[PDB]
Design a protein around this ligand. Structure first.
Ligand SMILES: [Ca+2]
Length: 74
DNA sequence: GATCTGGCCTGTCTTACACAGTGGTAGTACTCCACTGTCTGGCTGTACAAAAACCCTGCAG
């Protein structure tokens, strides 16, 4: 199997090349698709010319350190 | 084999059923900038009088 060669063959080499493995997973991005879905449901403009423009604008807003920092939630 | 007739099909006309909700854009009717000088009315040191509701008291029964 492919996964087996990967996990036996370069793991020490890669964690030497970088210093971790999970710290470069695409994992998080598959989560963020959830986000996209939700936005499309609720903050749509119902116009395919703009729908993406609006979605991207709201998304970017959602992913700024600034506004999250305002989200204290001690 | 001619005839007939109820039941079936096509086409018809009529009453319903989703299409909100979301963002960008604009006109527009409603509201504070700075500058002002002035006045009323709450505040404050005690002393003075006026109401209120009870508690005792006293006379009356
Ligand atoms: Ca209806």
């Amino acid at each position: 199997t492919n996964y087996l060669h990967k996990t036996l063959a370069h793991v020490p080499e890669i964690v030497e090349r970088d210093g971790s493995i999970g710290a470069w997973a695409s994992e998080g991005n598959e989560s963020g698709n959830k986000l996209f879905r939700r936005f499309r449901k609720m903050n749509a403009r119902q116009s395919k010319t703009f729908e993406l423009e609006d979605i991207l604008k709201h998304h970017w807003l959602y992913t700024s350190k600034y506004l999250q920092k305002f989200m204290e939630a001690h």
